[PDB]
């Protein structure tokens, strides 16, 4: 009986949340930006072709200087590219060749890695010996790591396959905070520009925005009918876009506490692997499983460009901090850096 | 002109050296066989791993056999969603599936008429018909044959195989269950199942793996380049 009344209370609260959301919902984003001009056909052209990886590229992250990038491709290699001249500044061997995520520290001194080994490994770039070495091999997760990101040189937040997220202190090597509440395993994670709040998408078809300091889920968002594979923050920090296996991208808003827009097309049937916003936040790029990426308008939901340069699934997507180039990694073991003209 | 200074030229040299190292490491990795071990928890997977040879994830066991390095990955310690990481093993040389022949009677803790070995064949069907494993041969290791022989004298095989229409002898029972296991393959044109019964000495059941991997690498060599 107690479980029954608790379930009744739960569904009553869920219905109240839905009523509140539909109450604050008055006009659609498409209606509001109906009269604005739409961007022309985006004409990205491949500017660089980073080669050297020998297996499916699974992770890629841009450096803060917008010149150095880090890639992982499940061949036991962590390659750091100077994209301007197409050079390899480092090639970090991996203890476990099942990496699924990467992160470049904002200070540029450390590089994160992690995969099916349930372990987040930190690698020190700026060292006196001259060779990249492991600084702290974080452990404590009971599931594969799907996304890792840096807050600063001594703190990260890692999303893993044990349906939980964890904020780790690098120096102590301990989970200084643990975030729980997702029924299914989480697959993506992204921080706010001020690194105060962060969103995480899971196979539960829900995206939860957590607070780093207080340590509990501030908000939860639903709307997808399948697992959420990618999440990314708006440059403003008041909205975020999630891509899922149901072949749709969705733009959620923080303050509105509900869904805002849906980017989908009938010709699109495969799911989303990665998402990324443009510097101004108007262009939303999404990597797909049909071996090409799509560039939508974040305000009009009209497809603005297609990046067809890969012959395998596009698994990575990143936009430089200055919004200059766009890096795409795919399972064909090639990275492509695109730019406009 | 060259439009490159000394530091840029030295960086290019460093990148070329890194490229050479990556090429050599990739060649060494290609000169290697990769296997993925699957099956139920109570299927003797630890025993077969021991016969071939801190975190509950993917464990890698490496062993040599007549100049054929083997890397075998056991992912049985992963309790998350399989469909979210199984594609990471898309390029494996072969898949080793272990099924215990003595679990035809035993039922799992959640005993709801779903037999342990019924779940075993459901898992085998899911693995065999997976989109990522269209061209990946499966080595079917049938374990605990002696104890299955002991058990079949008393417990009939018709309890969990009602459609059985043969004698209750171990040989015919094993042949029939082998054909039933191979029946679930819906991609007979591309992949083939190499079924072997675990024996006392590790030599026989590592030699079976060596022969199977040799045959499959020959087949992919003959099929990748356009021949055959």
């Amino acid at each position: 009986s107690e479980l029954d009344q608790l379930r009744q209370e739960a569904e009553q609260l869920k219905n109240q949340i839905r009523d509140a959301r539909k109450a604050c919902a008055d006009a659609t984003l498409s209606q509001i930006t109906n009269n604005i001009d739409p961007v022309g056909r985006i004409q990205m052209r491949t500017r660089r072709t980073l080669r050297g990886h020998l297996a499916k590229i699974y992770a890629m992250h841009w450096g803060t200087d917008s010149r150095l990038l880090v890639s992982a491709s499940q061949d036991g290699k962590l390659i750091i590219w100077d994209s301007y001249t197409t050079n390899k500044v480092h090639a970090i061997p991996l203890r476990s060749s099942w990496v699924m995520t990467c992160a470049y520290a904002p200070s540029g001194n450390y590089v994160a890695c992690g995969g099916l080994d349930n372990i987040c490994s930190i690698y020190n770039l700026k060292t006196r010996e001259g060779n990249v070495r492991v600084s702290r091999e974080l452990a404590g997760h009971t599931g594969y790591l799907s996304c890792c990101r840096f807050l600063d040189d001594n703190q990260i937040v890692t999303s893993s396959g044990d349906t939980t997220c964890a904020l780790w202190d690098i120096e102590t090597g301990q989970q200084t905070t643990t975030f729980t509440g997702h029924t299914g395993d989480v697959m993506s994670l992204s921080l706010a520009p001020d690194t105060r709040l962060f969103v995480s998408g899971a196979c539960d078809a829900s995206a939860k925005l957590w607070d780093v300091r207080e340590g509990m889920c501030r908000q939860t968002f639903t709307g997808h009918e399948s697992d959420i594979n990618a999440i990314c923050f708006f440059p403003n920090g008041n909205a975020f876009a999630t891509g899922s296996d149901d072949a749709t991208c969705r733009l959620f808003d923080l303050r509105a506490d509900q869904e805002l827009m849906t980017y989908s097309h009938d010709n699109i049937i495969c799911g989303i692997t990665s998402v990324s916003f443009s510097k101004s936040g108007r262009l939303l790029l999404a990597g797909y499983d049909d071996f090409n990426c799509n560039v939508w308008d974040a305000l009009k939901a009209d497809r603005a460009g297609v990046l067809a340069g890969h012959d395998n699934r596009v698994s990575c997507l990143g936009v430089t901090d200055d919004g200059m180039a766009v890096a795409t990694g795919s399972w064909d073991s090639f990275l492509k850096i695109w730019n406009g003209s | 002109g060259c439009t490159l200074s000394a530091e840029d030229k030295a960086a290019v040299e460093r990148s070329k050296m890194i490229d050479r190292n990556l090429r050599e490491d990739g060649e060494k990795a290609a000169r290697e066989v990769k296997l993925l071990l699957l099956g139920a928890g109570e299927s003797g997977k630890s025993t077969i791993v021991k016969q071939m040879k801190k975190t509950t994830g993917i464990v890698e066991t490496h062993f040599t056999f007549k100049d054929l390095h083997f890397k075998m990955f056991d992912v049985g310690a992963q309790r998350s969603e399989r469909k979210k990481w199984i594609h990471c093993f898309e390029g494996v040389t072969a898949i080793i599936f272990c099924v215990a022949l003595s679990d035809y009677d035993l039922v799992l803790a959640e005993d709801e008429e779903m037999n342990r070995m019924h779940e075993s064949m459901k898992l085998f069907d899911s693995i065999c018909n997976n989109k990522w494993f269209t061209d990946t041969s499966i080595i079917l290791f049938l374990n605990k044959k002696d104890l299955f022989e002991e058990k079949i004298k008393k417990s009939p095989l018709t309890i969990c195989y009602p459609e059985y229409a043969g004698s209750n002898t171990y040989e015919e029972a094993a042949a029939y269950i082998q054909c039933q296991f191979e029946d679930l393959n819906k991609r007979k044109d591309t992949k083939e199942i190499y079924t072997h019964f675990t024996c006392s000495t590790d030599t026989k059941n590592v030699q079976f793996v060596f022969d199977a991997v040799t045959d499959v690498i020959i087949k992919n060599n003959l099929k990748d380049c356009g021949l055959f």
Partner: single-chain antibody
Framework: VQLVESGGGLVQPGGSRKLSCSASGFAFSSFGMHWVRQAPEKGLEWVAYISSGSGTIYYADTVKGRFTISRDDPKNTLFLQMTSLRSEDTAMYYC??????????????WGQGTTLTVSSADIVMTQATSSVPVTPGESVSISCRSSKSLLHSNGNTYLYWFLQRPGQSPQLLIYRMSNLASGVPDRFSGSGSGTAFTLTISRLEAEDVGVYYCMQHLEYPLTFGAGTKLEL
């Protein structure tokens, strides 16, 4: 990180010697290793250069042909054979490590060097001042000049500032005219655009006295300067 050298001594002119450097504490095989010389009471002078993997080998004009540089990476050693030693070869020889990638700090570490006693070009770097008297707590400026603009087309200036304390091996202060080498106080700073470069020492104190050297890294016939001696 530690570089030690051996093989110096007295040599009759026309002889031969093999100086050796025994690197330790770092990845030697991934470092390009140089050779510098310093005539007694004189400025520095680049002698030779070998890249990682022995790819490109460069020699100074005055020693080309006589000097043969080589390295044994498995044993972490670097040898410099000399043939037909002349009386102009009497100098303190230092061995310098240097890696090259984006954001790297070449010439960061210098060995202690060994003493040897014998019985056209481009980028002539001139430092007008030679001896400057200083007082602790004050701010000083050091100026150097180059024959041609050091600002390459990639936006990088290739001017390096080194400091040699009295009776000690030189250490790297500033690389690429603006970046501070790791392990030095933040009071140092560099300036200049194409030809005239300035080192600005704010709140100078002891342990900072000694000679200061400017260096170019555009054309591999690397040229130092006379160096300015800050004396108390």
């Amino acid at each position: 990180v530690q570089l030690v050298e051996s093989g110096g001594g007295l040599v009759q002119p026309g002889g031969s010697r093999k100086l050796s450097c025994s690197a330790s504490g770092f990845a030697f095989s991934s470092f390009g290793m140089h050779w510098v010389r310093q005539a007694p009471e004189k400025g520095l002078e680049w002698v030779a250069y070998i890249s990682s993997g022995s790819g490109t080998i460069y020699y100074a004009d005055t020693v080309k042909g006589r000097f043969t540089i080589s390295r044994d990476d498995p044993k972490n050693t670097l040898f410099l054979q000399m043939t037909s030693l002349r009386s102009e070869d009497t100098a303190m020889y230092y061995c310098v490590r240097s890696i090259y990638y984006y954001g790297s700090s070449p010439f960061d570490f210098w060995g202690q060097g060994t003493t040897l006693t014998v019985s056209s070009a481009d980028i002539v770097m001139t430092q007008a001042t030679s001896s400057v008297p200083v007082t602790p707590g004050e701010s000083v400026s050091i100026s150097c000049r180059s024959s041609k603009s050091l600002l390459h087309s990639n936006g990088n200036t290739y001017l390096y500032w080194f400091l040699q304390r009295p009776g000690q091996s030189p250490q790297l202060l500033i690389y690429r005219m603006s970046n501070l080498a790791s392990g030095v106080p933040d009071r140092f700073s560099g300036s200049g655009s194409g030809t005239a470069f300035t080192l600005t020492i704010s709140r100078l104190e002891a342990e900072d006295v000694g000679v200061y050297y400017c260096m170019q890294h555009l054309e591999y016939p690397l040229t130092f300067g006379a160096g300015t001696k800050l004396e108390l």
